[PDB]
Design a binder for this molecule. Structure first.
Ligand SMILES: C[S@](=O)CC[C@H](N)C(=O)O
Ligand SMILES: C[S@](=O)CC[C@H](N)C(=O)O
Lengths: 176, 176
């Protein structure tokens, strides 16, 4: 027996830098998602990883999780696993930050959500947000990775660059 | 606009008695799960409801979430949505507090997990636990509700009562 528990993946002593923490996240995700293709399992655990990483980073986040492209309908996101407070159930493609990322297939970084026309506030206290789409082999949107922050200007390119890797990893480790 | 956000469902106050908070949760779940039968969406929000309900009751919880019965395997639970730290992906019926809940179809209230034979420690810090089976119309285990606590003796039969109510709403409102 290793002495490790599954939960030990979210121990990031605060002395580590941003690069180390996020690189650890990606490695934790591989190890956790290796055993199964089940997307509910992999994203649930992924949400925990994202949440604790950012808390460890001293980013005042209030949401960390996913929306997934609905089975029957190609243009609707349905709420998936997440860490944080009760969230919006369904989001059309093209609508708000999440639907915008879904439609453009491109990452969205928003410094002030109240200044973002069309913003879908699931938590009224959210001031900033990043959304990164999860792209299939055939280039289609499978879902989005979404993070909310209680401060303005919470996310930048480092978050985008890392979350784009996590998405590729998810596509490769999950059957949607 | 109502001036309410989705997140408001878990903006309780710590001065409400246990009965008020738990019944508020049942109503919140009902309102939130009304517009779709999607089980991931419905169980995601439910993990948030449960998490914040117990934090507000000042129970030192470390985990609140679900395992669901595998589509392929009728004797296997697979990790579902949760609030908490990273947890075990898969649990066989009859194994651990979760798996025992599953095969016996009987709620497990555990005052000391280290004294529970075959307990599955996903988080090594867990000291107590309650697990409530979700039962189908045909009397079959669809999944379990699971809550971990950092102190011994975290839970009682009032928690069972309310969680059994919740498991019924989950059955009534979700398609697995
Ligand atoms: C505007 S965008 O769609 C943000 C909504 C997201 N579901 C959230 O919980 O913040
Ligand atoms: C022993 S029983 O399976 C409890 C462990 C559970 N998988 C958890 O989330 O902690």
């Amino acid at each position: 027996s290793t002495g490790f528990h599954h939960a030990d993946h979210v121990n990031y002593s605060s002395n580590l830098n941003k690069e180390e923490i996020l690189e650890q996240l990606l490695l934790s995700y591989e190890g956790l998602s290796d055993g199964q293709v089940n997307w509910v399992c992999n994203l649930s655990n992924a949400s925990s990883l994202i949440w604790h990483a950012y808390k460890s980073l001293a980013v005042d986040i209030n949401w960390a999780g996913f929306y997934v492209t609905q089975a029957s309908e190609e243009n609707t996101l349905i709420l998936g696993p997440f860490q944080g407070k009760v969230a919006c159930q369904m989001i059309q493609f093209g609508k708000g930050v999440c639907g915008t990322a879904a439609s453009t297939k491109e990452t969205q970084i928003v410094p002030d959500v109240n200044k973002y026309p069309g913003h879908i506030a699931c938590d009224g206290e959210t001031k900033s947000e990043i959304v990164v789409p999860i792209i299939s082999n055939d280039g289609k949107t499978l879902g989005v990775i979404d993070i909310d922050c209680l401060d303005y200007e919470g996310f930048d390119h480092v978050d985008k660059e890392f979350l784009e890797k996590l998405a590729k990893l998810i596509n490769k480790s999950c059957v949607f």
